[PDB]
Design a protein around this ligand. Structure first.
Ligand SMILES: *C(=N)c1ncn(CC(=O)n2cc3cc(-c4ccccc4C(F)(F)F)cnc3c2)n1
Ligand SMILES: *C(=N)c1ncn(CC(=O)n2cc3cc(-c4ccccc4C(F)(F)F)cnc3c2)n1
Lengths: 707, 707
DNA sequence: GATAACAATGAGCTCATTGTTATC
DNA sequence: GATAACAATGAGCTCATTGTTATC
C-alpha cells in the first residue's frame, strides 16, 4: 500500500480478510497502547492506522476537497473502499470490521461520529452490516473496578460514600495515560472493550444525517436545547452492553460533545466569560495576582488549581486573548500585558511565545469584579476540588463591553464592543428608574464612524481623506481589518493595475497608507463617491446573533444590547441584594463576636472570671454557664471558645483593651451604616467608583497611543 | 535567489552592494524586532535571514556534510560567497557587512562564535577586513538606563543600593521580549547597538581555531579550568566600545557559554545532580510533594520558584529522566512515576507527553536527602529570589548510585551505576575506620554479568542460552541495549542471511528473544565460543572518564568509584559536624525559650507578675528589668517579647502549664542526648535507617517485575 | 576515518471541526 | 453553489553542538 503510518494486518486481502480488523487510532497514545495490547492476541489479523486530527466532514465537503484528503483516501485504500462502488458486504473489502480506538472524552465521540458519517454517507449499506463498525472503550477512572464514564465513578463514589477512603483512585483521563499492562489487560478481554454499532430501524440514518448535515442546523439547535432542558431524562449511555445502536450512540454520546462545544464557545451573559476565561480569571483572583508572571507559569497554575482539562497552548491563547487590547479587541482588558501580545497588524496573531510574555491583573479588574461578590457566587466542584464559579457577577455587563465571537455546535455568537461608559450611563438610568437609550457598538482607538445600516447591522468606515495632490491618505481602517491584510489587499489591487503606487508608514498601533492612483480613476471614484467603497474601507459589524447563556444555563438569543442590559440589570439587582444580605450577616456576626470578646476581657481583667490554673472542663463549663456565645464533647467545647481562650496575652493590656473596644464600636457603626443602604445604593456607589477609573484608563491609553 | 525566508535588500548586488548589510537573525523573535526596527532606517540597504538552530561546525565537518547543509549553502549564496574563491574584500560580495542579531545570552555567544568560525575557516581574509563581521547588542535588564549584561545590572544595583526602590526593572531576557518601540529605538541608535569585530594580531585566528577545532580539546580544557580558577581576573566584556576584538570576544564571551555548558552537563560529586535536576529536586522538597501531579504542572512550579531560565520541554525531559527506573537507568529514583515514563524498549524515549504523566517524590527521597541537612546547605540567590542550593548533601553518594553521562565544552563524563548497598557498606567500613573494598558497576534488574576487563573498562554480558533444539533463547540484553534496537539488529542480521528466523516475546520490562539459525552456523559459533560475541550480547561500560564538580566548584577527574567515595566521605563528615552543631544550637535556643516561657507563665499565674491593665511601655520595661531573654525603640521591645505576651490565654491553665513544663523537659533531655552523639554516630544512624529501606525497595521492585 | 551512541539546549509548522454572513 | 474569517481544541517532528571510544 505504501501508507506512511499503516501497520496493515498480515492476513489482509486473503482468505481471512473478513476476519481482520482495522483500528483507527486517534494519534500516538493509542498506537503505544496497541503495540502492547495487540501482541496478546492474533496480531496477524489486526491492523492499525493513526488519525491526525478531526476527520473531514464529507457531507458538505465538495468532491475536490474530499479527493484532496490524505486521511480519507488513505483509509479508503487500506479498507479497499471505493466511492463509486456500492458495497453490500465485506466481501470485496480487505477487512471484515473497522474499529475506532479514540479517547473516552467528547472529542473521541466527535471522531467516532465523523467516521460513522463518512462510512454512512459514502457506503450506506455497510453500516447496516452487523459488526462492520466497532469502537474500543477504555476506563477513565479506576478504583483498584474500572469505570468507563465519569458519572459512573461519581455515582459509585456517592453510593460508597465514606468507603472510598479505602480505595485508591487512578484517573486515566487521556488515552495515553495507559501503558503496556493496561494494553495487555484490555486486549485480553476484548469482548468487554469492543462494541459494534448496530442498525436497527430507519431512525439511525436520520440521526447521523442530522448530526452531520449542513442543512440541519436548526435540528441541531433543537437537539441541544432539548437535551439541556431535560429533568434527569438525559439517560446517560452504559457500556455493560456490546450492541450500541447508532441512534442511541448519537443521542447519548455525541450530544455530550455538542453541548460541551457550545459551553466552551458561547459566553455567559452575566460575566461575559467562557469557562476557560472564567478559570483563568478565577485563578488570577485566587493568587491575588498583582506582579507580572510568565504566561506559561500562569497556565500551569490555572491547570493545577482551576482543574483545566485541556492543553496549555489553548490556555496560553486564552490568556493572550484576555490581555489583548488593540483596536477591534477588548475595550477594558481584565489582564495586564507585558510583552508582545499581538497588534492590529496581524489581528493579535503576532504575539510572542508564552515563555516571553508576562501578564498580571489590570488595576480595574477588581473594580468590575468586586471582591465582595466573590462570597455570593456558587462554586463548581470538579472531582472534589473547588473550582471556578458557575458565573461571576461584574458591576457592568462585560459581555457587551468586550465583545465576543465563538462557534459552537448548533449555535454561534457574535457580540460587538460597546462603550463601557454608555453601558454605565444606561445602568444608572435604569437604577434611577428611567428608560434605556439605544446603544451602538463602540471600539476604543477607532477614529472611524459606526452607523447602523439596519437593525443589528452596523457599518464601520475607516477614515481615509483624499489629499489635494492626486493621492489618498488612509488613516484608520475599519474594525476587523489588519494592517498586513490591507497591505496584501493593496498589493493584489496594484497587481490588477488599479493603484500606481502606495507607501506605508504603519506603526504597530496606528495606520497610515498613502495610495497614488491614476488621476482619471481617482476623479471617477470621487464623482461616483465610491472612494471608500472601492478601497475596502467599509466593513460590517453584525449584532444579529447575540447568543449567550442566561443565569439558568440555557442558550438564549437577544435582540440587541438592550435586552442583554435589561437581563443583566435584573440578575445584578438580585445579586446586590444577596451581597448586602451577606455583608449584613457577616458584620452582625463580627459585632457579636467582638462584644463577647470585650465582655470576656473585662470579666478576666476585672477578676470576676479567673483563668489561672483552671481545669479545661471546669473553665469551659463556667464559660458556658456565663452565656458566652460559641463561634467555631470535649472537642466541641474547645472549638466553641477557641476565640475567647485563644486570644494572646497582649489583649489583657490597657492599650489593647481600648483598641478592642474601639474595634467593637467601629464594627457596630459599620453595621448600622450598612443597614440603612439598599442594594440600589450599593450598585450606584460601585458604578460611580468605576466610571472615573474607566475614563482615566481611556485617557491614559489615548496618551500612550499618541506618544 | 529563491531562499524561502530571505528578506534580501533591494540594493544588494548593485553599485551599493558594499553599503548593504545582512542580519543573521536567530529565528522569529529577532525577525519580529527587525520588522519594526529596520523601518526606521534605509530598509533598502538591510537584509534579514533567520537561523533555525545552532549553525554547523565546518572545521570537523566533512565536505559532504557541509555541502548537504541548507543553512550554510543558503547564507553563502545570499552573501555571494564561494568555497573555492578566496575573497580579499567585499568587492565580489553582494553585501558589505554581515551582522549577527542573536540573543544576549550564552547560546547567542555560541551562535556568533559558530558564524565567526565559518567565515574564518572558509574565507580567512574576510575577517581581517574591518567592518565585515558585526553583532547587534540589545539590553537584557532596563531600569527606566539600559544594561547589556547581567553583572552590570547587579553591579549597578549594588552601587545604587536602596535607591533601586525608585526604579522599575524590566527584564528583556529573551530576544523576543522586545516589541516594536524597542526595535525602533535600537535601530535609530544603531551605532550604540552595532559592534564590528576587528582583527588586530595573529592571536585572533589562534583563539577561533582553539574554540572551534576538533584537536584543541585539551586547549579547551585548559581554557575552562583557567577561567574557573581566576580570582576576579575574569574581566567581563563591556559594550561601551564599538571595536570588539576577536580574541577578546572569544575569551570574554564564548568562555561564559563554555563554562555554562560544562556546568549544565557535568554533575556535582556530592549530590550527583546537575543544576536543572537540583532545581527540580529543590522545588519538589519545597512543595513537600507527596501527591502525584502532572509533570507539566511541576515544570511550571519549578520555573516559577526555582528560577529555571530554560524552556519547559527541557524541564519535562529532566523530570522524566529523574523518574525513570528501567534497567540501565536510575538505581534509586528520587521521583516516583505514574504513567509512561519510558521503558528499556526504546531506552526511555517511549514516554508519554508531560500532560499525561504524573510524578511525585519517592518514599526514599527524604531518607537520602535528609530534611535536617536542608538547614546547613548554602542557597543561591538568582536576582534576589532564593533558589536551589549550591549542592545538596545526601547520605550516600548519589553520583555513583544513579550514574550519569553528559557532554560539556572541553569536558565530558560517564559515571556508571553502582550498588547503593555496596556504597552503604563501604561508607560504614570507612566510618568504622576500615578500608574500602573495590566497587564494580551494578545495575538493578540486570541478570547478566559485569566483569572488569581493564582498569575502568567493564564488560556487561546479557544471558543467552543455546537451547537443545538448534535455537538460542536470549533472556537479557547488555546494559545500554534496547529491545527495539535489538529487534532492528536482528532484522538487519537476518537480511544478511545469518539467522533463519526469530520470535520476540518481549514485555516492556523483560526481554525474551528466540533466534533459530542454520545448524552449521550455530555449531561453528559454539565451537569458537563466539555465540555472545556475534549476537552483540557483550557491551562496554566505561568508568575511565568520571568527571564531576568537587565541593569547591572545580571540574575534577576521579580514577574510579573509590576516589569519589573518599572525597564524598570527607565532605559528608564535615557536613554532619555542621548539622550536629546546627541542631545543638537550635535545641539550646528552644530550651532557653521554653524555660523563659515557663518562668513567665509561673510568674503570671502566681501573681508576682501582673499583666492585666498594664501600659505597654511599663510592662515591657518590667519584663526587661526582670531579666527575660529576648527572642525576636518601641518596635524592638515589642518584637523581643512577642513570644511572651503573645502566648494565648490557653497557656494559663493547669493542663497547658503542665504540658509546657513537659515540653521544656523534653527539649532539655533531647539536647542532652544530642550532646553525647558524634557526627559519626549520626551518620551511622542515617545509614542504618536507609539500608533496610533500600533493600525493601529492591525487593518490592523485583516482585513487581516478576509479577 | 568516520560514524554512532550518549544528554541539555534550542521553536515554528502543520488543518479539520462547528454556524453566520457576505461576497463570488 | 463555493470560499473567507471568525474562536476553542487537538501533537508529532524536524537537527546542530559538545567529548569519548569502538568499530566500521
Ligand atoms: C482531509 N482533507 C482530512 N482528513 C483529515 N484531515 C485533518 C488533517 O489532515 N490534519 C489535521 C491536523 C492537525 C494538526 C494540528 C495543528 C495544530 C495543533 C494540533 C494539531 C494536531 F495534530 F494535534 F491535531 C496538524 N496537522 C493536521 C492534518 N484532513
Ligand atoms: C547544516 N547542515 C546546518 N546548518 C545549520 N543546521 C541546523 C539545522 O539545519 N537545524 C537545526 C534544527 C533544530 C530543530 C529543533 C528541534 C527540536 C527542538 C527545537 C529545535 C529548534 F528549531 F528550536 F532549534 C529543528 N530543525 C532544525 C534544523 N544544519
Amino acid at each position: 500500500l505504501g501508507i506512511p503510518k499503516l501497520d496493515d494486518a498480515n492476513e489482509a486481502g486473503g482468505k481471512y480478510s473478513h476476519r481482520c480488523t482495522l483500528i483507527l487510532t486517534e494519534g500516538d497514545s493509542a498506537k503505544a497502547l496497541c503495540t502492547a495490547g495487540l501482541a496478546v492476541k492474533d496480531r496477524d489479523y489486526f491492523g492499525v492506522f493513526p488519525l491526525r486530527g478531526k476527520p473531514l466532514n464529507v457531507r458538505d465537503a465538495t468532491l475536490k476537497k474530499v479527493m484532496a484528503c490524505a486521511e480519507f483516501q488513505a483509509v479508503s485504500k487500506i479498507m479497499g473502499l471505493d466511492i463509486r462502488q456500492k458495497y453490500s458486504g465485506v466481501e470485496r473489502l480487505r477487512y471484515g470490521h473497522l474499529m475506532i480506538m479514540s479517547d473516552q472524552d467528547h472529542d473521541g465521540s466527535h471522531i467516532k461520529g465523523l467516521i460513522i458519517n463518512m462510512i454512512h454517507h459514502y457506503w450506506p449499506d455497510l453500516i447496516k452490516t452487523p459488526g462492520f463498525l466497532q469502537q474500543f472503550i477504555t476506563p477513565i477512572v479506576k478504583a483498584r473496578i474500572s469505570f468507563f464514564s465519569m458519572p459512573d465513578y461519581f455515582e459509585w463514589k456517592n453510593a460508597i460514600g465514606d468507603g472510598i477512603r479505602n480505595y485508591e483512585i487512578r484517573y486515566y483521563k487521556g488515552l495515553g495515560t495507559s501503558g503496556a499492562k493496561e494494553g495487555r489487560e484490555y486486549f485480553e478481554n476484548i469482548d468487554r472493550h469492543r462494541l459494534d454499532f448496530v442498525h436497527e430501524d430507519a431512525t439511525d440514518d436520520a440521526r447521523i444525517v442530522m448530526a452531520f448535515a449542513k442543512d440541519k442546523v436548526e435540528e441541531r439547535k433543537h437537539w441541544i436545547t432539548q437535551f439541556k432542558a431535560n429533568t434527569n431524562v438525559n439517560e446517560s449511555m452504559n457500556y455493560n452492553v456490546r450492541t450500541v445502536r447508532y441512534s442511541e450512540f448519537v443521542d447519548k454520546e455525541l450530544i455530550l460533545f455538542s453541548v460541551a462545544d457550545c459551553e466552551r464557545s458561547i459566553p455567559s451573559v452575566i460575566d461575559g466569560l467562557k469557562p476557560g476565561q472564567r478559570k483563568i480569571i478565577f485563578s488570577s483572583f485566587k493568587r491575588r495576582l498583582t506582579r507580572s508572571i510568565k504566561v506559561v507559569q500562569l497556565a500551569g497554575y490555572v491547570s493545577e488549581h482551576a482543574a483545566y482539562h485541556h492543553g496549555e497552548q489553548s490556555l496560553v491563547q486564552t490568556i493572550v486573548g484576555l490581555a489583548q487590547n488593540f483596536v477591534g479587541s477588548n475595550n477594558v482588558p481584565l489582564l495586564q500585558q507585558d510583552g508582545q501580545f499581538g497588534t492590529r497588524l496581524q489581528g493579535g496573531k503576532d504575539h510572542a511565545a508564552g515563555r516571553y510574555i508576562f501578564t498580571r491583573l489590570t488595576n480595574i479588574a477588581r473594580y468590575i469584579y468586586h471582591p465582595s461578590d466573590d462570597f455570593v457566587v456558587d462554586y463548581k466542584d470538579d472531582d472534589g476540588l473547588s473550582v471556578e464559579p458557575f458565573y461571576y457577577v461584574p458591576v457592568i455587563p462585560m459581555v457587551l463591553v468586550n465583545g465576543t465571537s465563538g462557534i459552537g455546535t448548533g449555535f454561534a455568537t457574535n457580540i460587538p464592543n460597546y462603550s463601557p461608559l454608555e453601558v454605565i450611563d444606561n445602568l444608572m438610568r435604569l437604577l434611577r428608574g428611567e428608560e434605556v437609550q439605544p446603544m451602538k457598538p463602540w471600539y476604543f482607538g477607532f477614529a472611524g464612524t459606526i452607523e447602523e445600516k439596519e437593525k443589528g447591522k452596523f457599518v464601520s468606515t475607516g477614515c481615509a481623506n483624499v489629499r489635494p495632490d492626486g493621492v489618498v491618505q488612509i488613516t484608520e481602517l475599519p474594525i476587523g481589518t489588519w494592517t498586513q491584510g490591507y497591505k496584501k489587499f493593496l498589493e493584489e489591487l496594484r497587481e490588477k493595475e488599479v493603484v500606481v503606487q502606495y507607501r506605508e508608514h504603519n506603526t504597530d498601533v496606528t495606520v497610515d497608507f498613502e495610495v497614488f492612483l491614476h488621476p482619471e480613476v481617482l476623479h471617477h471614484w470621487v464623482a461616483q463617491g465610491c472612494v471608500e467603497e472601492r478601497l475596502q474601507l467599509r466593513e460590517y459589524i453584525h449584532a444579529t446573533n447575540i447568543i449567550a447563556f442566561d443565569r439558568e444555563g440555557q442558550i438564549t438569543k437577544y435582540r440587541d444590547a438592550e435586552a442583554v442590559l435589561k437581563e443583566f440589570y435584573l440578575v445584578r439587582l438580585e445579586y446586590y441584594a444577596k451581597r448586602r444580605d451577606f455583608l449584613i450577616g457577616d458584620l452582625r456576626s463580627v459585632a457579636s463576636k467582638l462584644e463577647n470578646m470585650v465582655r470576656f476581657v473585662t470579666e478576666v481583667v476585672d477578676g470576676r472570671l479567673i483563668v489561672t490554673r483552671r481545669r479545661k472542663k471546669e473553665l469551659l463549663e463556667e464559660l458556658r454557664q456565663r452565656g458566652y456565645a460559641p463561634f467555631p464533647e470535649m472537642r466541641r467545647a474547645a472549638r466553641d471558645y477557641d476565640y475567647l481562650l485563644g486570644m494572646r496575652l497582649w489583649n489583657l493590656t490597657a492599650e489593647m483593651i481600648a483598641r478592642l473596644q474601639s474595634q467593637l464600636q467601629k464594627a457596630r457603626d459599620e453595621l448600622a451604616a450598612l443597614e440603612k443602604r439598599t442594594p440600589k445604593d450599593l450598585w450606584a456607589e460601585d458604578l460611580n467608583q468605576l466610571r472615573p477609573r474607566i475614563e482615566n484608563l481611556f485617557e491614559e491609553r489615548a496618551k500612550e497611543i499618541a506618544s
